[PDB]
């Protein structure tokens, strides 16, 4: 197994630049890798406080007490017992997929490939993140591992759902990263002048007025518009 730790160029990820600019690794090497996590420093002050408290407990001898107590509680287990359990599970079970799991995996793979195709079409550029048959093999292997850690001889759709969730959380998270602008600006200005500051209108009104319409998502990031009625109503939040 390969567990690699790398760093995007410029130290930070530098999401303002293109995702292919931040990663110097070519598509070939990225194709072999199954899961590709991209962690980002949120600088969330409450999260910062939580991490600071955890680290302070780590340093001031509190870790050696709380980890031991929590391990004795049974929700954590020592290194050696995990080692032996992993060995036993790997030497004991080699699960295989159920036909329903196969159908679900095929459907999810087609969905993921369609998503990558539409993303590349919108960007007019091949995505640095490759999604191929090897990715489907990776999902199959993760489903097998999930069934194996439970020692289940056959993989259930619960493992398929969890593997799809993890894939979306890591590989799609990498592939969903984004760095015409004239159309976006025109839409922004026309809705600012038309849609009143304190009022709302249905999304179908914007459709009839007239694309992917990423401008609305960008404005939601700017917190000037907000989709509330399950995406059927855009309200000028007050900006």
């Amino acid at each position: 197994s390969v567990l690699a730790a790398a760093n995007p160029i410029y130290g930070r990820y530098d999401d303002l630049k293109s995702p292919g600019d931040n990663i110097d690794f070519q598509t070939t090497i990225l194709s072999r890798f199954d899961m590709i996590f991209i962690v980002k420093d949120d600088h969330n002050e409450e999260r910062d406080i939580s991490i600071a408290n955890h680290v302070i407990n780590i340093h001031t001898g509190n870790a050696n007490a709380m980890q031991n107590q929590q391990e004795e509680n049974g929700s954590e287990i020592s290194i050696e017992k995990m080692k032996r359990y992993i060995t036993y599970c790997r030497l004991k079970c080699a699960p295989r997929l159920s036909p329903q799991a196969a159908e679900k995996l095929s459907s999810n793979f087609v969905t993921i490939r369609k998503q990558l195709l539409i993303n590349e079409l919108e960007s007019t550029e091949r995505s640095s993140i490759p999604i191929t048959i090897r990715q489907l093999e990776a999902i199959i292997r993760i489903t097998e591992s999930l069934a194996k850690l439970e020692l289940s001889p056959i993989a259930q759709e619960r493992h398929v759902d969890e593997a799809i969730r993890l894939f979306q959380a890591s590989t799609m998270d990498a592939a969903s990263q984004d760095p015409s602008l004239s159309e976006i600006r025109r839409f922004e200005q026309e809705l600012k002048r038309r849609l009143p500051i304190g009022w709302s209108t249905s999304y179908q009104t914007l459709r009839r007025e007239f694309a992917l319409d990423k401008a609305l998502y960008a404005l939601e990031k700017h917190e000037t518009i907000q989709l509330r009625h399950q995406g059927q109503n855009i309200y000028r939040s007050g900006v």
Binding site: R165, Q168, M172, R228, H229, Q230, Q232
Partner: protein, 242 residues
């Protein structure tokens, strides 16, 4: 009086980063902490001895949601919060607060040493006075009882039945809004737009915009207000809820 004298002296000498008040604490610094020490000794003498708990008793208010283990600590925290309002003297006020906490042997940045508002809020939006046609928002957890049963511009009273009706109206409106809220992702915060979805397509769990804990706190506030002011119909509504 300290800030008044400081402002007068500053104006006399002359005639926000820095205003007329920059050392007003010094007018009472020694008396303040001396009196704090004396009151601390007094309390420690009478914190446990009976017939003084009638003095060391925390009054019950409609907005009461904070437990006070030390009435003197609550007092000093309240004074520190009121004297921290000046932006120019922030450093000297923080130093005075630290010295006051040293009397309690408490750290300056201690969470218990941090002061928070002991009163919640429960406003009735768009309250209308049936005589002068005055539009107001009637709070109960912060507004005084004299300011809630009668109008402001005039002094005519209000209907108890109307107060209970509108309070229950806001309560049921909040309940319905919680029950009719929209879901959104927990990771990219995209609003949920379908009906069948375990999570966001980005593997983000669905979550409501109005937390259940928020409605729990609102119900607790309504129950506290009903019990404090004897709101019979509000208590009936609370009983109907569960």
């Amino acid at each position: 009086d300290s800030m008044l004298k400081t402002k007068q002296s500053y104006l006399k000498l002359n005639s926000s980063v820095e205003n007329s008040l920059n050392g007003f604490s010094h007018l009472f610094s020694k008396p303040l902490m001396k009196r704090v020490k004396k009151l601390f000794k007094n309390q420690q003498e009478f914190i446990l001895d009976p017939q003084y708990e009638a003095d060391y008793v925390i009054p019950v208010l409609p907005g009461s949601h904070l437990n006070v283990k030390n009435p003197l600590l609550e007092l000093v925290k309240s004074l520190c919060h009121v004297m921290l309002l000046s932006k120019s003297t922030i450093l000297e006020i923080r130093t005075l607060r630290k010295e006051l906490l040293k009397i309690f042997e408490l750290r300056e940045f201690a969470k218990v040493a941090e002061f928070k508002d002991p009163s919640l809020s429960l406003v009735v939006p768009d309250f209308l006075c049936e005589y002068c046609f005055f539009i107001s928002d009637i709070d109960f957890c912060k507004a005084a009882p004299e300011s809630i049963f009668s109008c402001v511009r005039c002094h005519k009273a209000f209907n108890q039945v109307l107060l209970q009706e509108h309070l229950i109206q806001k309560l049921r409106s909040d309940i319905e809004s919680y029950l009719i809220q929209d879901l959104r992702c927990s990771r990219c915060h995209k609003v949920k737009r379908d009906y069948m979805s375990a999570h966001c397509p980005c593997a983000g769990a669905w979550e409501g915009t109005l937390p259940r804990e928020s409605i729990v706190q609102k119900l607790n506030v309504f129950k506290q207000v009903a019990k404090y002011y004897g709101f019979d119909i509000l208590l009936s509504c609370i009983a109907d809820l569960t």
